[PDB]
Structure formats: structure tokens, C-alpha cells
Amino acid sequence: STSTIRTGTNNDILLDDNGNMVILRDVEACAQDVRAAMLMRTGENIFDVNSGVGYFEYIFSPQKSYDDARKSIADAILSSPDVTGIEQLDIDITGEVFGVDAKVITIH
Amino acid sequence: STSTIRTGTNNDILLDDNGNMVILRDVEACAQDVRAAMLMRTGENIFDVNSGVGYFEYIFSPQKSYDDARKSIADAILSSPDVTGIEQLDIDITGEVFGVDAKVITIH
Amino acid sequence: MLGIFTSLLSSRSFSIVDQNTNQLVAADLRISRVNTRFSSVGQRHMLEDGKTKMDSRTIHPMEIIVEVFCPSIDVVDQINQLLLDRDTLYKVITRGMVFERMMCTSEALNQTPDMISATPARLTFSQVLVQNPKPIMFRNAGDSSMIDRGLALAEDVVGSAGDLFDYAVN
Amino acid sequence: QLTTAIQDAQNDSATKILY
Amino acid sequence: QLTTAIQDAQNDSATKILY
Amino acid sequence: MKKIPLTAVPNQAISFNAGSSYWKIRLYQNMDMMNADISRDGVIVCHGVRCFGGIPLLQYSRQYRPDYGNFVFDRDADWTLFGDGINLFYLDGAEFAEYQALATRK
Amino acid sequence: MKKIPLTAVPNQAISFNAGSSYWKIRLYQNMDMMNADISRDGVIVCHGVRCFGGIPLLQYSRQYRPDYGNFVFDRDADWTLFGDGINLFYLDGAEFAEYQALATRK
Amino acid sequence: MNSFLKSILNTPTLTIRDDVTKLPVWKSLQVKKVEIYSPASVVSKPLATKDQTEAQVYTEALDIDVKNGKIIQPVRLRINAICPDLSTVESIMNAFNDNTSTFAITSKSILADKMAIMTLDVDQSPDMLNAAEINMEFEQVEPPVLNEFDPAFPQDSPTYGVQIQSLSDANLLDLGAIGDSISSAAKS
Amino acid sequence: KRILRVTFNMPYGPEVIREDLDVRVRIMKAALRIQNRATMEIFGLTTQLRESLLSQFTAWKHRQRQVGREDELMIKVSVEAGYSDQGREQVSRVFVGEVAIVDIISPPPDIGIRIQCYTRQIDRTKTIRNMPPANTTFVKFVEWGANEMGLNFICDTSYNDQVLKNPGRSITVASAILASIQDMYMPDVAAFVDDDILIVKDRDKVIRPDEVTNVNSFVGIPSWSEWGVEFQCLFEPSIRVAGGVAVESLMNPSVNGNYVITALEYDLASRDRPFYIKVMGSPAA
Amino acid sequence: KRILRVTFNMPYGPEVIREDLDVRVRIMKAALRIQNRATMEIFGLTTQLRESLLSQFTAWKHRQRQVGREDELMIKVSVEAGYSDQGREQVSRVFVGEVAIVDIISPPPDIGIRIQCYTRQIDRTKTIRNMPPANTTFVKFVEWGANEMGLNFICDTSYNDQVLKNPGRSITVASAILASIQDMYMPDVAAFVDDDILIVKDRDKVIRPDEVTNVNSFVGIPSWSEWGVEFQCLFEPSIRVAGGVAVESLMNPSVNGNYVITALEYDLASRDRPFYIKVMGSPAA
């Protein structure tokens, strides 16, 4: 049963109306954790390093094949607890947009 | 050798002319038991829970295939003692009737 | 085979349902052939006079082999997750033939010039034999049968009775 | 096999008195 | 075959039972 | 002080050698509380002991004397939170005497 | 009082250690009744004992004395209902003495 | 090709009965091939011979040695059929899963009896959308040795010695001999 | 349809392991001083069952601790094997003894245990509570030994009325009693313990003249030996040790006769071919 | 064409079991006090031959009966093995001893016995008829032992003219004589019995120096060992126990030299591949 502090789109601790910290559990907590994990560049953990998405070696670079980017994103999604797998992972490329869509099948 | 109290279509103990309880045995008892076991929704037995026919998740629902309904009916029929197997079973669906016919091959 | 008159023009044939959470998995597989082979062994015992008593019969676990085409990468990844999934038993409904307690044993993906978009795959499941295929459960939380844990070898802390008291006070 | 016999031989030589 | 060696570690029994 | 390991199932029984004695505790959900049956060295010490936080399980002297020890729940017994949140602690004679001396003047 | 399991077989022989004696009872259907050949410690004791409900199989004193015990049928012997409905019970010396005292003043 | 015009004493009808109930089981099981393998085992090492004896006294000795030197292995069938109905297949799988199952397979003219299922293959292929191709294997549990035996009546049966070991004490509403006496005096 | 049960005895109760699990019991009983042994390979154990069984089976609490005055020091397990068809059972008893060793033979994905049970492994007894007779006859010394071990006795021999001086005052434990009764008078009369019955009899006599077992069906061939007739058979729940056999063979016509049993080789596998018992027998007198 | 015969001795006469029947003889001999062993598996026995042999082989009539004063108590069997081509034979003798054990390994359809013989299994001899010497030399004690056993002797040692006070009056039966001769002076001089000849000699000396066996062809490779050279060879009817060997190898040039024999492992199978003898040898002095 995952649980996480409530954060806004600015990725900062967002409090409630009474000035407390909200602890989301299960589905919403897992969704927020997945969104936060997909925004972490590789080599940003002093205590994991090899964890994180390849935003500068697989994406944003003249990479021949985006299968490595797909694998890195899949690993980042699966790294979150209670994720099990991914039902669908679209890696569509627009003119200058790297559109990624996930269909996580988290156990909750 | 099965033996059950005699009951009518209203599924209550219906006594004889002299106010006694008749205990049917062998084929009649097996037939009564099969009819009773096919009319019991699942989750009604507090001591089995999983036993019973899925009249609400396998029948009476907007499903794709009624294979689960046939499996549930077959399991419910086989659960009765001295039934061995089912010779023939129909899952006919009329306009609004879920016609089921069985040919139990109980040994007696 | 016949036995059921669905009278519906959109019935799905194959279904791999996760037994827990009761969810479809790998719903985009394009199945091509399914072989649900059983197995059992006799105990032929030759004895004295020209004769052989077979004794009893042991039911070996079911094997089921599914040939399929995976059209998409997410489906291939779902198949890989099925193989790597060691904690769930699946239920395979091929054609009016339901098999519970089914676990993926093998999988072979094939990539050939004969098919560049999709990938042929040969899944293989084996059934998990259980002592009681029909278990007995209880609805309410009070009435479980008792579970023994045997010897424990109680481990150690240093907290003193004062801390336990203060905790009980709070 | 022989490990069973070894285990048997060991169990023979266990009694309740050290000397 | 350890069975032949078992059968060999039995021959040490003469007519004397001495007993 | 030793916390006896527990698993989150409703009705259960654990046996162990603690304090130079062979204890066995059977914990089961009875209605809305938890009851415990305690046996030491085979013979049964008590049946149907209602379990509460801080309050010792062996409630009468004839059971925990001499220096036999006692079992205490930090919080009210709850098999849903066994292992993660609620632990049962075993105290030997000296620790339990100190706990009693503390607890009688609260 | 010890219950001796039976088998729904028209003719059988049951062999057991009961009451510090080794009994062997061969029960067979004879015409329209059941007869029993009883042997203790190898040597035969009686042959063709007509069997009934409540009447001890070993009738005469020197067969059940001293404290040898006896065998009693709850109902009239019938191999079709053996095991479920009819049971044969073994009584030691004291139990058979108390049963005899009870049945000598019916 | 009128297939209903079957022979009278060599009728090609596979009839799988059931030795317990003697009823035809798994009807509507259109058969496509039946192969009956009946193996045996003969001596491999050279038999000894004792010559310099007479005519016809060597003959029965050799006959006994020969009758002593072959072992008959049970019969197997391999039926290939096409099941049109789900009921037949569910019954076949249930019978296979049942540990205790003896049947009597009757081919064109064979009456192979006391036969149990060893293997069962159900193949569903895109060329047989309805029905499924089935391949079953049968093995003889026991050859039809003629039980001469002491029949027809419950008496006259041989003694079967059930060597019991430990007698249980008692149960029900019994208090020793007074309980026994009350139960007996109830005349029930 | 083979039916094999391994019934333990633990504080919770008897936890019967049925034949549905892969079980394989190899027992070897004989008419000697040595404890008859049973090796048990049991597969398909769950985590809870393993915790319940293996943790109870231990060699501690009597060497580095005390926790011992009577039974419950080590778990006693019995074996009930037989056949079952048409609804009738044939479950006899084929072994009663206490475990001594436990190991694992098969690693995952099938965690299979292998325990080793020996009959009368409660030699951790009260170091002979009652003193042996000072002067006494053989039958009375046998009765004392049976009383000390707690087992009923069958003493049928021609050496009963022979006096002994100091019959077993060097005995240290209950198990050594059987070794002593075996030690004296060992041309023929070898005493042993079959299940819970201590048998002291001559080697050429049947414990039970009325319990001869007529044998006509054998697996393989009933053969000769340097002592008597040796033959294997399918499991018959009426063949004990030291019992009388009435071999009536077909392949070997001259091995027919009446024999007593000296050894026994049970090999029972519910989920495997071997379900045979091998009998060593000697001519009976 | 291998030619292997097992020749029994029974009241009817010798019944030679030829190589046409499937025979497998494993003989293991050594320069020890231990009786050399022969395990022979014979298949293809007729019912009559089985009844004529196995019935005679027994361990009774000397324990529960008397029927004994001399030989004919147990059947003495010899083994004659060799090669044969162009009409000439090479059948030497490789074992002489009495049967001790009878069993069947292979059940029908090939009823094949397996019998176990030891050399000098007449240990139940006339409980030492002639008293051992009071005070004598080693050679004369050896002569007394050989005379008592009835076997001719080869005594070649440097310890012969050593007086022994009191050489072996604790001996109970004839067999223990060899154990005693082995017990005294046992760093090197170990006495044994090869066939019907009792050999007492130093371990580094050869019985017959003129009878060295030049060996040039081996099976495998003649390898080193703790003591000397060990090697396997095809059956040569000229290699005995404790004989002299003149190994001349090719694969291993360092093992060349003269060796005496200590252990011999015959494995002769008429209808199977193994027809080799394995030789343990030590440096000869």
C-alpha cells in the first residue's frame, strides 16, 4: 500500500486548506509517484545513479532508434512500487514533440 | 447413498398425509439435490463462500461469452454427491430466456 | 465445440484472465492454434505368472501450448511480464474449456523476414497441481482455522520496562 | 544409497549417557 | 556396489558363537 | 524485553522457548476483541484471556510467579496490524516486577 | 469400552491386541444369523457363537475369567450395516463385571 | 460409402462402456483411427539346455522353461477422434482427472476390457473451428483373468482377514456399561 | 488406488500428510536388536507446513538446554498404507517411530524434505527407572524390560526357564535393554521391537501359528537364498515381521512350504511405481 | 572367443556352467588375511538347474541340525577362464572357494541368480584338531597352520628363524589361523591363501623369481600409485597373486621396472565387454 505526500504540478509539497500535509494512498499515490519518476533525469540519485530516464542519451539526442528510450521509460515506470507492468506505451514522434503515453496496470 | 428430506417446488419441507417427514434416497434424492444446488447464488454459504452458481457475475450480466456461466453450472451440478458427471448440458439463449437443460448421469 | 448457444455475433474466443483481480491480460494476442495436452502415468507391475497389474494412476499436470502472433511491442512486453510473473496464477479460456491455476512455463518469440511487423510467439503454460482443487473458505473474519507457526526463537530488543510503560500511557 | 546407511550408523552411536 | 561390501562385512562369524 | 513475532492472520498459535520455559500462545479474534490461550511447559495456564494494551496477559499471581515473566501488548490487540504496528513483548521476572511497580502507582 | 471397527463383508477375520490379550474374531454369515469363531493368544476359545444384541460373545465364565473381558453387540449382528449402525464393543474385566451386574437384574 | 450398412459380426462401432455401470459413455465421439498395441517380453540371455535325455522328457521341460521365460505386457489403444460437443470433452477430461476409472473399449471386433486413460490431447486449430481433434490413449489395468471365485451369495464368500491394530475407545452418549445397557435395552 | 498417510503427533494434533502430495517411504524392519528405519521423502510442502514440521523436529533442548522429562521431546510419527477401491479401505499400520534426521533432497521449484525415523528413538529415557532383577529367569527379565520400555510383550521361547546372575546391570538406557536381551542367547532367539510390541521368540518359530499368510501372487519370482525363501510382493496389509508365510509358487515349484519372516523391505511411493514389500523368510519349525 | 566355466562340486558330480549362458564373475583377491571374494551372476538357469544348485546352497544343517563332519557341508566351486582360438585352449583357474550367499538380481523373464563365494569358507572346521606349538619358530608355526588347514605352503621370509613364545592358542577355528599368522609380524610379511596354496612371505619378495611376467600391452595406461604401479590388462592365464611382473610401458616411460603383485581384480563377462584383470603392484626387492 503505497503512500505519498501531496504535490502539485510544480512538484512542490502542496498543503490542504487547513495547512496540513495530505498523504495519498494506493491509486493516486502510485500515479503521482509514476509522474515524478518519469521526470527524473538519469544520474540524479547520489544513491542510485543508474536509475532515472535517459533524457540526454536516448531522448533529446540524434538517436537512431527510440527503442532505448522506450526501454528507459519502461524501467522508470516499473521502478515505482506496486506497478506490476505497463499495458501500453506509445512513443509517438510529432514534428518536435516526443509524445509518450503510458497505461500502467498498478495493482491498486 | 444420498438421502434428503422431501421438499416441494416452494423449496420448503412439505409433509406427507400423516404429518411425517419423508427421506428420499438414491435417484430422487440426487435429483432434488441437483435442483436445489442449481438455485443457490454464490456467496450464500458462509462456510464455503466460493460455492454456488454465479447468477450475477456469470449470468444476468452484459458479458462477452457465457463459457464462465456453463463452467459455474457444471461445477454446481458436480458438487452434489453421487453425480459423477454430466452427460449433456444446454446453455440455450432465447430472446430473454437463459434456457439450461442438464442430463446428470448420477450413479445409483 | 458446441454446448452453448451464445446467439451473439461478437463472442471472444481466447481469454487469459488473471485469477486475482479478475482482469484480462495480453488482450491483443492473435491466437492461431492451441494444444491442451493432458498426461498421466501407469504403474505396470509384472508379477510371477505372465501378467502385469497396472496398480493405480497418477495425474500429471496439464500442459497447454498456444501459438500466437503478437502485433505490438506492448503486447510482447506483456508476454514477457507474464513469463516473469511468478506470483499470479492465470486462467485460460480457449473455447468453452476453462483451465484455472495455469502458470507460464515457456515462451519463444520468433523474428523472421517472413513477418516484419508482428512477431510469432509460442507460449506454453503448465497447470499447478493442488491437493484440494475446491477449497473451503469462510465469510466472516472470526472463524478461521488456527494456523500454527511452530518454534519461533523470540528475538531481542533493548527498551526496558519504562519505555513500554510510557508507550502504554500514551 | 550409502548416505542413508551412514546416517543409520551415526544414529546407532547416540545414547543418553556421555560416558 | 555397496551391497557386496555389506555382504562381505558379515563373513566374520565362525561356528563359535562363543557366547 | 522480547517482542514475540506475529503474523497478520485472525486465529493463530505460536510456541517458543522464552525465559527458560516452553510458552505457547494462541491468539484468536473473538467478536470485537482478541482472546489468548496461554500454556507453559505443556499444561494450560489460562484460556480466553481478553487482550488489551499495556495490561499483562497473565493477570493472576499464581501464573507468573515466580520470575516466570509476563506478556504485554503495547496497544490494544488487533490482528490486522500484527507485525506492522502492534507487537507483543515478553518480560522476565525482574523486568515484569519493575513494570508492575511502575504500573501500580500510575 | 473399546469400539472395534468392522467391515461390511459377509465373512471376515479381525485380529487385535485388546486388554493385554490377543484376540481374533472370525465373523461369518451362517444361514440367517451371524456366527463368530473367537481365539485368544492363538488357542481357540469358542466356535460358532450365535451373535445377538446385548448378549456377550464369551458366555461361560472360564472364557472371560479372570478379568479377560468380553465382546458385546449393540444390536443384532448384520454385516450389511457393519461399521455404520452396528458396532462391536470390547469390555475389560471391570467393565464387563459392571455390565454383568447391570444385566443380571434387568 | 453408405456407412450405415455396417457388418453384422464385424461392425465398425467403437463402444466405450464403463465397467462400473455398464453403460455406453462418450457417445457422439466420431472416431478416426484406432491402433491397438499388444507387446510382450521374451528372454534375452541364452537359456540353458540339458540334453542327453529322452524324447518327450526334454519336451515338457522346454515347455515349462518357455512358459516361464516370457512376460506379457498390457494392451494399449490410441484412439484418434473428433469431438463435436463440449459435453463429451468435459466428460472426457473429468474421467481422465478421476483416479479411479475403468472402461471397456470395443473396436471393430476387439473387446479390450479394464482400460484406463493414460494421455489425452485436445487440439484446436483454425481448420476445425467447430469441434476439436482429440487423441486419447488407453492402457489395460488388468488382463481379463477369469475369476473362478465363490459367487452368487453373501455367504460362501472367502474369509478376508483385516488385521486391525488399535481399537478406539468410544463416542456418542455412552457412559461405559450403563450406556451400553441403555443402548441395547432401547431395542434399536 | 494406493492410499498412504504419514501421521505425525505434535502439540497442535495429528497433521496427516496424505497421498496427494508426492510421498516416498522406504522402511526396512528386521528381527534384530537394531531399530527398524524409515526414510521419508515428502515433496510439495508449503511454507506453513515446513515451519510447523521441521522447526519441531530438532536435536536440541536436550543437550544445550533441559526441556525434557517425557515424550514430546521428539515427534512420534506413524505410517498407514494400503489400497482402496469401491469405497472400502485397507489402511493398515506399517511403521511407528520418532524422527532423528531431517534434510532437503530436492531444491526449488519443488522443496522436498527427507526425514529419517527410527523405531524406539525415545532412548532418552529415565536412564532405567527400575532396577533389573538381581537373579531371575529369562522370561521375567524380558517382562522387566518390556515394562521398563512401556511396551506389551510376546515372550514365546524354550529358554524362558533359565536363570541369570546380574541380567543387565551395566544397562545405561532403555534402548540397551533390547541389545541385552539380544546379546544373551544369540544362536536363534533374537528379540526385537515391532511397532509397540516387544517380541522375544526363537528364530525358527512363528509368533502366530494361526496367522499364516497364504501367498500365491509374487512380483518377479519367489527364489531361494542361503537361509530360506526371498520374494517381493505387492502391498498386502496382513504381512508383519516374524509372521508365518505359506508360499505357493508357480515359477519355482520347490520353494513351496511354510516359512517364518526375518526381514521386511517396504517401499511405498504414492506418485511413483515402487509400491512393493520384500520378504526374507526362513524355514519354519 | 572367450571361454569361461563355473565348475561346482556336488554329490552328483561337477556341473560345469559354460560361457553360452550369460555369466559374469567378479573376483577380488589380495595379499591379506581376508578371504578373497567371487561374485558371480549367472542368468539363463533352467528350473531343474536352479533346483539342483540353489537347494544345495544353504546355511542350515549346521545351525539348527547336525548333518556335518567334513566337506560336502558347503559346495566348493572353481572358476576356469581363458581364451580359445584355432582349436587351442587357455583355460586356467582363477578361483576356488565355497558359496556363502544366494540371491536373484534380475527378475523374469531372465531369472538370473547372483551367488557369493569366499575362499576357504570351511571356517567351521574341526575346531583345531592338533594343538599349536608351545614354543617354536615362525616357519614351524606356519607349517602347523598349513597342515591343519590341509593346504600346501610356500614359506619364504627372513622371520622364519624367530622363536615365538606361545604362538596362537587363543585360536578358535581353522580360519583364525591365517588371521594370527597375519597378526604377528605385520609391517611387511603378510600371509594369505591363493586357491589351495598358503603363501607366507615378505611383501617385497616374489613367490617365484623365475616366473616373472613381462607385460607390454595394457588397457588404458599403466599409472603410478602410492606404493607402485597400477594397471589393467586383458586376461592372461599366467598372472597370479603376489607374482612377479616386468611392466614395460609406452604411454608412461617412468613406470618401467620389476614389480610384485599385491591385489588382483578379475572381471570376466562372457556375454559383455568387461574381461579385464586389474593389478596393483609394488616395487620388488
Q: What is the 3-state secondary structure (H, E, C) of J139-165?
A: HHHHHHHHHHHCCEEEEECCCCCCEEE
Q: Least CA distance to E16: which residue of chain J?
A: J172
Write out the H or E segment, with its range, that includes residue I54: helix I47-54
Q: Least CA distance to D4: which residue of chain I?
A: I39
Task: Spell out the alpha helix ranges (H) of chain J.
Answer: 47-53, 138-149, 175-183
Q: Which residues contact J105 (CB under 8 A, 6 or more apart)?
A: J41, J112, J114
Position I194, amino acid = D
Phi, psi dihedrals of residue I158, rounded to the nearest 5°: -95, 0
| DSSP category for residue I87 | T
CB contact under 8 A, C77 and A74: yes
Task: Give the β-pairing of H113-124 and H71-72.
Answer: unpaired
Whether the Cβ atoms of residue G98 and residue H176 lie closer than 8 Å to each other: yes
Residues in chain E: 19
Bridge partners of G50? G35
In which residue are the cell numbers 607366507 written?
J200
Burial E1-19 (b: 16+ CB within 10 A, else e): eeeeeebbeebeebbeeee
Q: What does the alpha-carbon distance between residue F14 and residue F4 come to, in Å, rounded to a whole number?
A: 9
Q: Which of H165, H177, H183 sits opposite G74 (nearest CB)?
A: H183
**CA distance to B4, B40, B54, per residue, from B103 (Å):** 20, 19, 20
Whether the Cβ atoms of residue H26 and residue H16 lie closer than 8 Å to each other: yes
Smallest Cα distance from I218 to chain C, Å: 5
Q: Least CA distance to C47: which residue of chain J?
A: J108
If you count residue pairs, one on H and one on J, with CB atoms under 8 Å apart, how many are there? 48
Q: Residue D12 has which C-alpha cell?
A: 546407532
Query: What chains are in contact with D, requiring at least 3 Cβ pairs below 8 Å?
Result: I
Q: What does the alpha-carbon distance between residue H68 and residue H48 come to, in Å, rounded to a whole number?
A: 13
Whether the Cβ atoms of residue J147 and residue J130 lie closer than 8 Å to each other: yes
Q: What does the alpha-carbon distance between residue C154 and residue C151 come to, in Å, rounded to a whole number?
A: 9
Instruction: Please state at what angle helix J175-183 crosses helix J138-149, rounded to 10 degrees.
Output: 160
Phi, psi dihedrals of residue I176, rounded to the nearest 5°: -65, -15
Question: Closest by alpha carbon to C27, among C40, C36, C37, C17?
Answer: C17
Q: Which of I37, I101, I172 sits opposite D15 (nearest CB)?
A: I172
In which residue are the cell numbers 513500554 written?
C164
Q: Is A68 helix (H, G, I), strand (E, B) or coil?
A: helix
Write out the H or E segment, with its range, that includes residue I48: helix I47-54
Q: Sheet containing I190-194: which strands, arranged edge to edge? A: I152-156, I197-201, I190-194
In which residue are the cell numbers 482402496 written?
I84
Query: What chains are in contact with J, requiring at least 3 Cβ pairs below 8 Å?
Result: C, E, H, I
Phi, psi dihedrals of residue C143, rounded to the nearest 5°: -105, 40
Whether the Cβ atoms of residue I61 and residue I68 lie closer than 8 Å to each other: yes
Within the 17-76 window of chain B, which residues sit less than 8 Å (CB to CB) from chain C?
43, 46-50, 64-68, 70-71
Q: Does E contact H via 3+ CB–CB distances below 8 Å?
A: no
Handedness of CA C139, C141, C144, C150 (dihedral sign): positive
Q: Is C16 buried (19+), middle (13-18) or exposed (0-12) by CB count in 10 A?
A: buried
Write out the H or E segment, with its range, that includes residue H181: helix H176-185
Phi, psi dihedrals of residue I140, rounded to the nearest 5°: -75, -35
Q: Least CA distance to I251: which residue of chain C?
A: C48
Q: Which of A84, A88, A107 sits opposite C74 (nearest CB)?
A: A88
Q: Does B contact D via 3+ CB–CB distances below 8 Å?
A: no
Task: Give the β-pairing of H132-140 and H113-124.
Answer: antiparallel
Q: Residue I166 has which C-alpha cell?
A: 546380574
Whether the Cβ atoms of residue G47 and residue G59 lie closer than 8 Å to each other: no
Q: What does the alpha-carbon distance between residue I258 and residue I243 come to, in Å, rounded to a whole number?
A: 11
CB contact under 8 A, C3 and H72: no
Q: Is C118 buried (19+), middle (13-18) or exposed (0-12) by CB count in 10 A?
A: middle
Q: Does I271 touch chain C (CB under 8 A)?
A: yes
Residue ranges with strand state E in chain H? 15-18, 31-37, 40-41, 71-72, 76-83, 103-106, 113-124, 132-140, 160-162
Task: Spell out the alpha helix ranges (H) of I123-275.
Answer: 138-149, 175-183
Q: What does the alpha-carbon distance between residue C36 and residue B70 come to, in Å, rounded to a whole number?
A: 19
Bridge partners of J198? J153, J193
Q: What does the alpha-carbon distance between residue C56 and residue J221 come to, in Å, rounded to a whole number?
A: 52
Our separate counts of H helices and E strands in chain A read 2, 4
CB contact under 8 A, H87 and B88: yes
Q: Is A57 helix (H, G, I), strand (E, B) or coil?
A: coil
Smallest Cα distance from C97 to chain H, Å: 8
Q: Residue G86 has which C-alpha cell?
A: 452396528
Whether the Cβ atoms of residue I207 and residue I201 lie closer than 8 Å to each other: yes
Q: What does the alpha-carbon distance between residue H45 and residue J52 come to, in Å, rounded to a whole number?
A: 20
CB contact under 8 A, H69 and J21: no
Q: What does the alpha-carbon distance between residue J198 and residue J180 come to, in Å, rounded to a whole number?
A: 13
Q: What does the alpha-carbon distance between residue J249 and residue G20 come to, in Å, rounded to a whole number?
A: 76
Whether the Cβ atoms of residue A87 and residue C74 lie closer than 8 Å to each other: yes
Torsion-angle region of I44 (φ positive above 0: left; ψ -120 to 50: alpha; else: beta): left
Instruction: Please state at what angle helix I138-149 crosses helix I175-183, rounded to 10 degrees.
Output: 160
Whether the Cβ atoms of residue F55 and residue F29 lie closer than 8 Å to each other: no
Question: Closest by alpha carbon to J64, among I31, I202, I256, I241?
Answer: I202
Q: Which of C4, C134, C137 sits opposite B67 (nearest CB)?
A: C4
Count CB neighbours of H133 within 10 A.
17
Q: Does G11 touch chain I (CB under 8 A)?
A: no
Phi, psi dihedrals of residue F3, rounded to the nearest 5°: -85, 125
**CA distance to F14, F51, F92, F106, J12, per residue, from F88 (Å):** 12, 10, 13, 21, 86
Smallest Cα distance from H46 to chain J, Å: 6
Question: Closest by alpha carbon to H16, among H109, H112, H121?
Answer: H112
Smallest Cα distance from H68 to chain I, Å: 6
Q: Residue H151 has which C-alpha cell?
A: 459367487
Torsion-angle region of J170 (φ positive above 0: left; ψ -120 to 50: alpha; else: beta): alpha
If you count residue pairs, one on C and one on J, with CB atoms under 8 Å apart, how many are there? 3
Q: What does the alpha-carbon distance between residue G94 and residue G81 come to, in Å, rounded to a whole number?
A: 29
Question: Closest by alpha carbon to H34, among H132, H101, H109?
Answer: H109
Question: Closest by alpha carbon to I35, among I117, I94, I114, I140?
Answer: I117
Q: Which of B78, B89, B107 sits opposite H21 (nearest CB)?
A: B107
CB contact under 8 A, G79 and H154: yes
Whether the Cβ atoms of residue A37 and residue A4 lie closer than 8 Å to each other: no
Bridge partners of I5? I80
Q: What does the alpha-carbon distance between residue I174 and residue I195 come to, in Å, rounded to a whole number?
A: 16
CB contact under 8 A, C147 and F1: no
Chain H residues near residue C46 by CB distance under 8 angstroms: 41, 71, 73
Q: Does A84 touch chain C (CB under 8 A)?
A: yes
Q: Which residues contact C63 (CB under 8 A, 6 or more apart)?
A: C36, C37, C38, C39, C105, C124, C125, C126, C127
Q: Does H71 touch chain B (CB under 8 A)?
A: no
| DSSP category for residue I187 | S
Count CB neighbours of C6 within 10 A.
17
Whether the Cβ atoms of residue I193 and residue C20 lie closer than 8 Å to each other: no
Instruction: Indicate which of C72, C75, C81, C111 best probes the interface with A, i.e. most A CBs within 10 Å of its own CB.
Output: C81
Q: Does A78 touch chain C (CB under 8 A)?
A: no
**CA distance to B5, C74, J85, J241, J263, per residue, from J237 (Å):** 91, 77, 14, 12, 16
Instruction: Please state at what angle helix F93-103 crosses helix C160-169, rounded to 10 degrees.
Output: 40
Whether the Cβ atoms of residue G23 and residue G104 lie closer than 8 Å to each other: no
Whether the Cβ atoms of residue H89 and residue B71 lie closer than 8 Å to each other: no
Q: What are the DSSP calls for H41-74, one per residue?
A: E---SPPP---SS-TTHHHHHHHHHHHHS-EEPP
Q: Least CA distance to C5: which residue of chain B?
A: B92
> What is the Cα H32 distance to its own chain's centre?
23
State the Cα angle at J284 between J283 and J285, rounded to 5°: 120
Bridge partners of C63? C37, C126
In which residue are the cell numbers 607402485 written?
J228
Gyration radius of chain I's alpha carbons: 20
Q: Does H81 touch chain B (CB under 8 A)?
A: no
Whether the Cβ atoms of residue F87 and residue F71 lie closer than 8 Å to each other: no
Q: What does the alpha-carbon distance between residue C166 and residue C160 come to, in Å, rounded to a whole number?
A: 11
Q: Least CA distance to I189: which residue of chain J?
A: J64
Whether the Cβ atoms of residue J248 and residue J216 lie closer than 8 Å to each other: yes
State the Cα angle at I154 between I151 and I156, rounded to 5°: 155
Q: Which residues contact H11 (CB under 8 A, 6 or more apart)?
A: H108
Write out the H or E segment, with its range, that includes residue J190: strand J190-194
Whether the Cβ atoms of residue H165 and residue H138 lie closer than 8 Å to each other: no
Question: Closest by alpha carbon to A28, among A57, A6, A59?
Answer: A6
Half-sphere exposure of F85 (CA within 13 A, CB side): 9
Task: Give the β-pairing of C30-37 and B101-104.
Answer: unpaired
Position G23, amino acid = W
In which residue are the cell numbers 406427507 written?
B16
Whether the Cβ atoms of residue I268 and residue I25 lie closer than 8 Å to each other: yes
Q: Which of I55, I221, I275 sits opposite C150 (nearest CB)?
A: I55
Q: What does the alpha-carbon distance between residue H85 and residue H26 come to, in Å, rounded to a whole number?
A: 10
Q: Least CA distance to I185: which residue of chain E?
A: E19
Q: What does the alpha-carbon distance between residue G36 and residue G11 come to, in Å, rounded to a whole number?
A: 10
Half-sphere exposure of J147 (CA within 13 A, CB side): 11
Whether the Cβ atoms of residue I219 and residue C45 lie closer than 8 Å to each other: yes
Whether the Cβ atoms of residue B92 and residue C5 lie closer than 8 Å to each other: yes
In which residue are the cell numbers 520400555 written?
I149
Position B43, amino acid = G
Whether the Cβ atoms of residue I56 and residue I10 lie closer than 8 Å to each other: yes
Write out the H or E segment, with its range, that includes residue C64: strand C63-70
**CA distance to B64, C3, C45, G56, H98, per residue, from B91 (Å):** 14, 7, 45, 62, 25
Q: Which of I85, I93, I195 sits opposite H100 (nearest CB)?
A: I85
In which residue are the cell numbers 498386502 written?
I236
Q: What does the alpha-carbon distance between residue J26 and residue J15 come to, in Å, rounded to a whole number?
A: 20
Q: Give the 3-state DSSP-derived string for G11-66, with helices as H, strands as E and coil as C.
A: EEEEEEECCCCEEEEEEEEECCEEEEEEEECCEEEEEEEECCECCCCCCCHHHHCC
If you count residue pairs, one on E and one on J, with CB atoms under 8 Å apart, how many are there? 27
Q: What does the alpha-carbon distance between residue I135 and residue A84 come to, in Å, rounded to a whole number?
A: 80
State the Cα angle at I119 between I93 and I89, rounded to 5°: 10
Chain I residues near residue J48 by CB distance under 8 angstroms: none
In which residue are the cell numbers 485368544 written?
G40
Whether the Cβ atoms of residue C109 and residue C76 lie closer than 8 Å to each other: yes
Q: Which residues contact I191 (CB under 8 A, 6 or more apart)?
A: I33, I142, I178, I181, I182, I198, I199, I200, I201
Smallest Cα distance from I186 to chain E, Å: 7
Phi, psi dihedrals of residue I166, rounded to the nearest 5°: 55, 75
Q: Does H21 touch chain I (CB under 8 A)?
A: no
Position A83, amino acid = V
Position C5, amino acid = F
Half-sphere exposure of H3 (CA within 13 A, CB side): 3
